[PDB]
Amino acid sequence: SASQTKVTTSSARGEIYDASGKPLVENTLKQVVSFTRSNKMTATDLKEIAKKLLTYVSISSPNLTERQLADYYLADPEIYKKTVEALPSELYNNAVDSVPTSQLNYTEDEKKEIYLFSQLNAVGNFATGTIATDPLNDSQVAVIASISKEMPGISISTSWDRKILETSLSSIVGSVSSEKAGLPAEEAESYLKKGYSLNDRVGTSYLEKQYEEVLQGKRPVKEIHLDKHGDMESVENIEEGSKGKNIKLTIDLAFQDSVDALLKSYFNSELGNGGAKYSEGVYAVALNPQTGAVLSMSGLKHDLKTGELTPDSLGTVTNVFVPGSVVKAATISSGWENGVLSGNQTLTDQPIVFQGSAPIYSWYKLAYGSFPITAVEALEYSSNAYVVQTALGIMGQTYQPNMFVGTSNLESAMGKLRSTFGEYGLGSATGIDLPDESTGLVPKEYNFANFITNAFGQFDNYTPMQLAQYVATIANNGVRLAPHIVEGIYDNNDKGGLGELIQAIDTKEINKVNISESDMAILHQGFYQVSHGTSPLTTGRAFSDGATVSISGKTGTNNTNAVAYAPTENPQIAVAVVFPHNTNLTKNVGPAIARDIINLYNQHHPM
Ligand SMILES: [Zn+2]
């Protein structure tokens, strides 16, 4: 029978780099007081160590918990034997812990040695823990190092402050927990199970959290074995510690910055002319449709209460917007999957009149009367009649003007429409490499009118990322890919910086949309004619106006959203622009913004 026990110490966190290698985070090296605890140190011994250490360190904002107050009170061996004396070893510690009031009389200078006592008390037997204090300077550290021998247990070691660098990707990088705030409390149990200490610093937000396993530094491990009582025999080493592995993003700072500037430019323009007065902002996501790589995620928040403009790149994955007409492709796709439409089917474009409700029109209203229209043309002219007749078909009915609609098949129809939408990413999880994306506002309580509006993008709300995946799906011929913001995992070179490739994050297929290849080609013809058409009803000629490459896309019609991919023949970029609640009917900047993003990218990475 011999006693076994192993202790661990954390290392430097890996760093985060943009597509070109610029660092986005900083490990600033610092020196800290460390404490190594022995099974032999009593609480009175620990008290004596705190008081000696208080002469050398500064303690500013001590926020002691009752648990800590009581531990310090009960340290006195005589006062512990007395407090349990009046009660009706671990169970005996906890019951005696509910026996004293925390209304104790400790001077402010007293509260300081209680804080330190706490820090020493938190360190497990034989382990080496950090003793959090105010920043120590070079001279202050040299004093402590020289008188360490007088406080057995105390030493000076090297730690690291984590800081985020001022860039447009600073919001996406996320946060890491302090060594004082320690391991996050509502998750403490699930980390201890993994191997983490109590005062470890771990990603609590966005990328730091998502790639925690990659960024966390490898630990140096030591074993200690115990004799008879459980006392230290010798201190043997198992594993030598190293800096965490690095991650490189798919986003390039230069490009991201130029998209932010372009969004601000268009937003102010629209704000100035009054069109954007009640608009919450403008968001843009550009993806690579062959891989799912995220090329930029930009956002500009306009506060409707003060008026201020602030960056909001996370809005692309957390905020939801009515999509408008850009979703017409997904509704037509649903008609094909549910046997309502056959290839490029001709419908009458007519006002849609249901009993007990206002007629439904398209943007051109009555200007051309009723006329035959194909699926290609339905996308090109952005026809509501077409998608409304399609939706009504999914519900099992043929449109006749003035019809009373039976709603016996409404849950089934809505389910089928949303199911198709979900295949494109609209209302479902995108797969993106962040801990918590919104999946959109998809209401479970709805009626017939809602089902119909949903068909032309006027009910379910989606995020800008979902809308980008949708059009990247069309660009990738129906094969929907998980977006990823990280490109590969990287080693470190000789002095803690971007070394060589460990594991390139590879493409992930999620599903393939259940439509024919020729049906997918009909959606491609539609999206092309939106931008290249010659009809008075053609809706997106602005996509082509000064384009350096051939753009295909779809406008959203209040609402000035747009989606696009390019080049048409061999798509390498797919973009979604979300510009909610813009009242300018005159000129539609949605397509213009998407074109410019695509031009921006083409100038940066030639296609
Ligand atoms: Zn051993």
From Swiss-Prot:
Gene Ontology CC entries for this record: plasma membrane
Extracellular side: 1-607
One Gene Ontology MF term: penicillin binding
Record flagged with keyword Cell membrane: yes
Listed Gene3D superfamilies: DD-peptidase/beta-lactamase superfamily (3.40.710.10), Penicillin-binding protein 2a (Domain 2) (3.90.1310.10), Penicillin-binding protein, N-terminal non-catalytic domain, head sub-domain (1.10.10.1230)
Keyword Magnesium: no
InterPro entries assigned to the protein according to its UniProt record, in alphabetical order: Bact_Transpept/Beta-Lactamase, Beta-lactam/transpept-like, PBP2B, PBP_dimer, PBP_dimer_sf, PCN-bd_Tpept
Subcellular location: Cell membrane
Coiled coil stretches, renumbered: none
GO biological process: cell wall organization; peptidoglycan biosynthetic process; regulation of cell shape; response to antibiotic
Active site: 325
Family matches, as SUPFAM superfamilies: beta-lactamase/transpeptidase-like, Penicillin binding protein dimerisation domain
Domain of life: Bacteria
Membrane-topology descriptor: Single-pass membrane protein
Record keywords: Antibiotic resistance, Cell membrane, Cell shape, Cell wall biogenesis/degradation, Membrane, Peptidoglycan synthesis, Transmembrane, Transmembrane helix
Effect of disrupting the coding gene: Essential, it cannot be deleted. Cells depleted of PBP2b continue to grow more slowly than wild-type until at least 12 hours after expression stops. Cells form very long chains and have an altered shape, becoming lentil-like rather than ellipsoid. Cells are more sensitive to amidase and have an altered stem peptide composition.
Free-text function comment from the UniProt entry: A transpeptidase that forms peptide cross-links between adjacent glycan strands in cell wall peptidoglycan (PG). Part of the elongasome machinery that synthesizes peripheral PG.
Similarity field: Belongs to the transpeptidase family.
Subunit structure: Interacts with MreC in the elongasome.
Miscellaneous section: Structures 2WAD and 2WAE are from strain 5204, a clinical, drug-resistant strain with 58 mutations in compared to strain R6.
Notes on the domains: Comparison of drug-sensitive and drug-resistant protein structures shows the active site is highly flexible.
Protein's UniProt name: Penicillin-binding protein 2B
Organism lineage string: Bacteria, Bacillati, Bacillota, Bacilli, Lactobacillales
